[PDB]
Amino acid sequence: GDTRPRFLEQVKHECHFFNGTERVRFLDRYFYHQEEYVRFDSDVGEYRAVTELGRPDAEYWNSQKDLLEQKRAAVDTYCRHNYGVGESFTVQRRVYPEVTVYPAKNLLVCSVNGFYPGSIEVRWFRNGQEEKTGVVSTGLIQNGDWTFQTLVMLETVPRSGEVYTCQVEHPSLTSPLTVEWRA
Amino acid sequence: EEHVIIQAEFYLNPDQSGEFMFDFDGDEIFHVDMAKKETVWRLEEFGRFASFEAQGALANIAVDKANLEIMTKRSNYTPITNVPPEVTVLTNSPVELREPNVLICFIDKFTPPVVNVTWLRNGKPVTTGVSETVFLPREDHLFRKFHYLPFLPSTEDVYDCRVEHWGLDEPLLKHWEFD
């Protein structure tokens, strides 16, 4: 459509948590288009110019004491505070997946659907034994609705009287999910 | 298991439009509606367990504009290089006839965060039953967006997700049908 130049300013305040809140890290990042020009890292304590465009802001911001204090407290006042408020339904959110096995579209496909979080382990079994052979997976698709999806198929020429299994481990389940489909 | 919460925002000139949103591990917790000054939760239930002073976000956007001014001048008006989107359309689950599903249009890896998206069923529009997400940030600082269309599969119908972006030199139609 247009061609009239666009100017984009991006800002990102990141809270990285490790083992719950045992190790919080705050990043205050500013970008010009896709370019990060300056950033504050909690494990560093001050502003660092990421590119020469940020040199001016870093030298000035880092001289303000009230502002620095505030960014330094952020891991507590901001990161930890917010974690405790949303953990109730973000970190602890769990939706079991719906597993489906169908011949294919000879590929025996295994479709694990509508689950959350991301942690997932899907294995295929040839008559009881695992198959790390010819297993193409479509990574881990994100649906944009706090739901994930992934397809993992088995490349094979099925014989008669042979059980094929798809095991699915997932935080939302106590026992592993299993879908057996022989032939 | 590392977890990450990010407060993402942006301001775009000359469109004079911005965004303010919270992200948890790549998903949107909510974003702020600048005009109504209300906080729009990605999921209805989220508002039951939390809240956010929606208006404070304007202060951030106001400064992000201020800085774009400064920043756009220190670089001597170097505009942004467009990056057309990679569009995909897959079903929300395995497809079965006469069995209700949801078509999704994954628009991803692109900038600026401006785009026109239209769903077409049998070559014509569908302005009802559709929803959409705002621009979600990417690890590389580009964006992704989701558009959705609830539908009843049938050989009888064919669909197109039409997308217009400035990086493209012509609208894009990613097809989806039942073979």
Binding site: F26, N82 | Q7, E9, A50, S51, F52, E53
Partner: peptide, 5 residues
């Protein structure tokens, strides 16, 4: 939620 430019 508390907000942190």
């Amino acid at each position: 939620a508390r907000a942190x430019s």
